[PDB]
Design a protein around this nucleic acid. Structure first.
Length: 538
RNA sequence: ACCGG
RNA sequence: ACCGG
């Protein structure tokens, strides 16, 4: 049937001029040595990406799918959504959202500028007065930083981004924002992925695994899910939206949005040249995250019925999806999964790499991470979220005139605070750096570093400062990643940590806390870490 | 550099 | 800002 994209062969130009690395990376050259391996995706690689994503979809649904879709609409019916006032939309625009082509930007929008509030009214009236004309959109290359994997063919090409003018973006919010806060939580419940902090993701996955007599789990990746979404799936999404309590104005607009934007349209580069036409998901629109989730759920669940997966419990983080079922024997389990894949493939949701059944929770990668285990302070098992540290380390090492990685360190320190690689490698490096800049209290991305222990206690719990026997997978993987990037091995980081710890303590004050809590693992004679007063405040 | 979290 | 698309 339909082709995901068409191409005029125009260049996909970049926004922020791509910047050359420099001969000295002063913040990270003590973190790791192999900067040659750390690269960022250029837009000249945008061509390469388009080939990977341009291709024919053909879709064949069935009794199974139809039954799920019927059930899901019935859940949609229990929802009541309201329009957002044009103003309310504007206040939800992010601070530096790319300015509109009609001479105004996010400051104006958020402050209800007249030029702004006028054009948007016009944009909206046109949505109600016109549901066929395709809305033009812009296509850009997202630049992300990775580490060269030769195993999987040198360097990734840049991801493609497609979005409409800021005027239109606000209207989408007017029409849909309320649905986006109500619908998913209501068609998918426990299985909606974004509602969970890593702590609770783990807690769910455990509860799911616990409650099967003889569990079996697998994860289904679709690394081009956006390309494989069909015009019909999109309209089916509308159909799901319309199944709720909605005012007639909302309904007309949603429809008009679906036909004019969400289903497809032309794309233009920053230079303005017609770049191509699209017939799949746009990354930049409001519904994407919600759409993919719901669609993936309908399909996935159809597939389980088609394949005969028993007692399936699901988790959907957009494209990435985990299922935990009752094993029907490894013999059947391998059959049923192949089925699942054929089902999904008919549903126009193929995979990258086929799934495999697994019977150990440590081996189920998804939401780009996995569950693993170490021992807490009293010997009890502590289950926690982790991932391969390669990219985190690569990015930890990205420095240019217009970019600092310190935020990325703080990022992963928070998110992955209880992992051995954060605790031993990124923390030791972070404080080591900030101490020497004597910049230990400057607010990085709106967080004070001296608040870390308090934050970590709130988000991860006291055992995040005290875990101790890390699993073979993790130990192996981390060793390997550091070796792979020219980082010192774990044992060196221990030394470094002790010295870093000695300082933080002698500094007294909040710094002292950081020393005693964050690096308690570093010392021979451990310290009884009682809970933190400041902790209940966050 | 758009969307989500 | 970070992380995911």
């Amino acid at each position: 049937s339909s082709m995901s994209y068409s191409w005029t062969g125009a260049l996909i130009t970049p926004c922020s001029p791509e910047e050359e690395k420099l001969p000295i990376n002063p913040l990270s050259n003590s973190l790791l040595r192999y900067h040659n391996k750390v690269y960022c995706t250029t837009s000249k690689s945008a061509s390469q990406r388009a080939k990977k994503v341009t291709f024919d979809r053909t879709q064949v649904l069935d009794a199974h799918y139809d039954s799920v879709l019927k059930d899901i609409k019935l859940a949609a019916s229990k929802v009541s959504a309201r329009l957002l006032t044009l103003q309310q939309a504007c206040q939800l625009t992010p601070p530096h959202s790319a300015r509109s082509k009609y001479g105004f930007g996010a400051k104006e929008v958020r402050s209800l500028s007249g030029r702004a509030v006028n054009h948007i009214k016009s944009v909206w009236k046109d949505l109600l007065e016109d549901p066929q004309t395709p809305i033009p959109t812009t296509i850009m290359a997202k630049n992300e930083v990775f580490c060269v994997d030769p195993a999987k063919g040198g360097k990734k090409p840049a991801r493609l981004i497609v979005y409409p003018d800021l005027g239109v973006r606000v209207c989408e919010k007017m029409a849909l924002y309320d649905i986006t806060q109500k619908l998913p939580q209501a068609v998918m419940g426990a299985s909606y992925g974004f509602q969970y902090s890593p702590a609770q993701r783990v807690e769910y996955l455990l509860k799911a695994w616990a409650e099967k007599k003889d569990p079996m789990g697998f994860s289904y990746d679709t690394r081009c899910f956006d390309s494989t979404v069909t015009e019909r799936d999109i309209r089916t999404e509308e159909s799901i939206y319309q199944a709720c309590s909605l005012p007639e104005e909302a309904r007309t607009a949603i429809h008009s949005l679906t036909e004019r934007l969400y289903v497809g349209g032309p794309m233009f580069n920053s230079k303005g040249q017609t770049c191509g036409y699209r017939r799949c998901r746009a990354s930049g629109v409001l519904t994407t995250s919600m759409g993919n989730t719901i669609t993936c759920y309908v399909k996935a669940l159809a597939a389980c019925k088609a394949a005969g997966i028993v007692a399936p419990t699901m988790l959907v983080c957009g494209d990435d999806l985990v299922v935990i079922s009752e094993s029907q024997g490894t013999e059947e389990d391998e059959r049923n999964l192949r089925a699942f894949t054929e089902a999904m493939t008919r549903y126009s949701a193929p995979p990258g790499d086929p799934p495999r059944p697994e019977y150990d929770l440590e081996l189920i990668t998804s939401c780009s991470s996995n569950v693993s285990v170490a021992l807490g302070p009293r010997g009890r098992r502590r289950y926690y979220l982790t991932r391969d540290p390669t990219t985190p380390l690569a990015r930890a090492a990205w420095e240019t005139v217009r970019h600092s990685p310190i935020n990325s360190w703080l990022g992963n320190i928070i998110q992955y605070a209880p992992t051995i690689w954060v605790r031993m490698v990124l923390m030791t490096h972070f404080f080591s750096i900030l101490m020497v800049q004597d910049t230990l209290d400057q607010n990085l991305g709106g967080v004070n570093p001296l608040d870390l222990p308090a934050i970590i206690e709130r988000l991860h719990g006291l055992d995040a400062f005290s875990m101790h026997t890390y699993s073979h997978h993790e130990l192996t993987r981390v060793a390997s990643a550091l070796r792979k990037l020219g980082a010192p091995p774990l044992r060196v980081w221990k030394s470094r940590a002790r010295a870093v710890r000695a300082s933080l303590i002698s500094r007294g004050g909040k710094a002292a806390v950081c020393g005693r809590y964050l690096f308690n693992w570093a010392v021979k004679t451990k310290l009884k870490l009682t809970p933190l007063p400041e902790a209940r405040l966050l």
